[PDB]
């Protein structure tokens, strides 16, 4: 089960995207939302990430590269990218493969790294964060 705080993050990310008329909800919308998700935010703070700079980089990339739906079309609305779907499925898989059920924003953060052609993964690695850094924080704290 995706926990309450994760569900809140996902639903608000999707709503923001819909209000801006974005054709897609991306892994970058996802990472941007995780910055204010306690579980993922804590993990990133432990990795000494400049969250103000990462926020700006994500916001700039999202508005510049995400196509916007025409003002005259109500047959099709904001959809998740395949990459976004894979990240959620992977986070659930990783948690279940450890014999557990609760999925947090930190588990979703771990799963983002496997989308190697995503800008989100690139930015995380640019900020010196590795998949293992997050997993170590989840398992052992700071």
């Amino acid at each position: 089960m995706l926990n309450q705080e994760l569900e809140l993050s996902l639903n608000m990310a999707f709503a923001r995207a819909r209000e801006h008329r974005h054709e897609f909800m991306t892994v970058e919308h996802l990472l941007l939302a995780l910055l204010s998700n306690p579980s993922a935010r804590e993990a990133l703070e432990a990795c000494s990430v400049d969250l103000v700079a990462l926020r700006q980089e994500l916001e700039a990339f999202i508005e510049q590269t995400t196509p916007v739906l025409p003002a005259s079309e109500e047959e099709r609305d904001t959809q998740p990218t395949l990459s976004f779907q894979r990240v959620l499925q992977r986070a659930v898989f990783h948690v279940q493969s450890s014999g557990r059920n609760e999925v947090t924003g930190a588990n979703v953060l771990v799963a983002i790294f496997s989308e190697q052609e995503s800008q989100a993964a690139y930015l995380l690695r640019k900020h010196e964060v590795s998949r293992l850094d997050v997993v170590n924080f989840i398992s052992h704290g700071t």
């Binding site: 089960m1 995706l2 054709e23 959809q79 395949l82 779907q85 800008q119």
Partner: protein, 94 residues
């Protein structure tokens, strides 16, 4: 709505060209439909791109991020499949 349950040198990911390939069965009207529906082209430009697909064998519909390109390709191919046309949509590094 969406159901979230059920649905060292470092370089940035590259951009991708989204391409429409020609075939002998897909009607010109459908190719134009696809260009307007999934790429937001007006009738004029959609018609020009359809002719390019027809005469050149292929045509670039747009350039997007790897993530967006992959999704657009799947959406177009799913739409062609639902309408029973062998219209092939692909992608390649820009």
């Amino acid at each position: 709505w969406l159901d979230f349950d059920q649905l060292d040198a470092l370089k940035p990911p590259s951009m991708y060209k989204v391409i429409l390939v020609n075939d002998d069965y897909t009607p010109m009207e459908f190719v134009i439909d696809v260009l307007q529906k999934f790429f937001s082209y007006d009738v004029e430009r959609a018609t020009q791109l359809m002719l390019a697909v027809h005469y050149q064998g292929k045509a670039i519909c747009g350039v997007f991020t790897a993530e967006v390109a992959e999704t657009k390709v799947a959406m177009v191919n799913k739409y062609a499949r639902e309408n029973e046309h062998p219209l092939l949509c692909t992608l390649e590094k820009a």
